[PDB]
Every structure is written in structure tokens, then in C-alpha cells.
Amino acid sequence: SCIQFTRHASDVLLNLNRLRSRDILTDVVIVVSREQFRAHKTVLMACSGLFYSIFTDQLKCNLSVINLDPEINPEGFCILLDFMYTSRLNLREGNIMAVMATAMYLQMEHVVDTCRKFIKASE
Amino acid sequence: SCIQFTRHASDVLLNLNRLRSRDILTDVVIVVSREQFRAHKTVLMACSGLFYSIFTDQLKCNLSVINLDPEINPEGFCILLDFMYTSRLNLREGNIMAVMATAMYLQMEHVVDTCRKFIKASE
């Protein structure tokens, strides 16, 4: 018999992004080919199967720095980190291959699906 | 020129609630008249003007335990904490006064608004 507030989840995510933009309560640095990205462990886990696995590990949960595979493109990561905090994906002809490869590595199934569809339309 | 995934914010919140239910990466205990509630500081800040003010304070941001005013009802708090993580509010005739008072104290403007409307309909 609950009532539901339609915009609550979107409003929560918007506020989490405001905390990220002001570097408030960020608890991890993600290193991608020397580029550094500050974020909230919980948001990374909520969006990515890879971060979920990493931060539920009894040893890795305590790390303040996580280094990604050297094949990961920093721009592809930046676009996906923006998507995690906003639901908006900046998908372009010039970045789609790097975005799909990064989403496959991060285990972000819905992003992988839209990249496969956009690539299939261009062939 | 971004594309948007409609269910992303809801899916993020659902995963944050799963982390709460398994006590994963919770970083604060909220004490309400001896009852204890574990939560994520970021989610509390994203939902409440009071928690936003508390955890942006240079001294309080580092506290692992926060004690609420003794007038706050633990059931009212529990219903609001559930709303924060799910967008669902268990509003009932028997709890509406405690829920409205707790939402006013926590500074959760949309909850206060729906309580005022439901109370006005009953008079």
C-alpha cells in the first residue's frame, strides 16, 4: 500500500553527480593510462559488474586507488563515468568503438547493447 | 547529442538498496532513541537537507555515528530511510504524523508536501 515519488531516483542521481562535481565524499581514484578519475565506490558498484566484483572483495574493498587494464581508453572511461552519474551517454561515430570496449570490460550490459545496435545500423 | 537510458536512475537506486540490505560499504550508523540504522552517507545527503548539511561539515563528515534529536520516532525514521532507497513511502493513518515530523526535521520537502496534502484530505 506504498505511494511512490516518480522523480525520486532521478533526483538522487542528480545530487550524487553534484557531490562528484564538488569532490564531496569521493572515496576512490580510478587510474586509466595515467589519467585519474575520482568517484564514489557505491555508484561505481551500482553501475558496473566489474566494480561490483572489485569492491565486494575483502581485500580490494579497502583500496583508495584502482588501476584499470592499460588497453582501456581514458576518453571511453570518462564517457561511461558521466553516464553512470547522469543516465546520459555521449555516443559518437568517433568514440563508439572505445565506448563499447570499455563497457564490455566494465560489464555495463545496457551500454554494450546500445553500442552493438548503433554499430549494426552503420554496416 | 547524448542518448538517455530511461531506467538507469531506478536501476542505480535498486542496486544501492541491495548494498544496504547486505550491509555493503555502509559508512555511518544513525541512532534514533537507541535504535540503530546503517546507511550510506552519500544516499542520506542525496535525499535529505539535514544529512547534506551534516556530512558537508568539515568535522561531522568524519563521524561514523550520528545521534538524532530524542523527539524523532524510530518507526518514522525507518519509513523515511526505506523511501530514500526505494522511492516508496509507506504512509498510513497511524504513522502520518510521525512521518511528517521526521521529514520536516530531515528536510525532505517532497515527503512533507504529500503528508500535508493527505492530512488536509482527512479534515
Binding site: 506504498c2 505511494i3 511512490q4 515519488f5 516518480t6 | 516508496r88 513511502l89 504529500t114
Partner: peptide, 4 residues
Amino acid sequence: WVIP
């Protein structure tokens, strides 16, 4: 607010 809605009835979910």
C-alpha cells in the same frame, strides 16, 4: 506521487 503515484500508486506504483
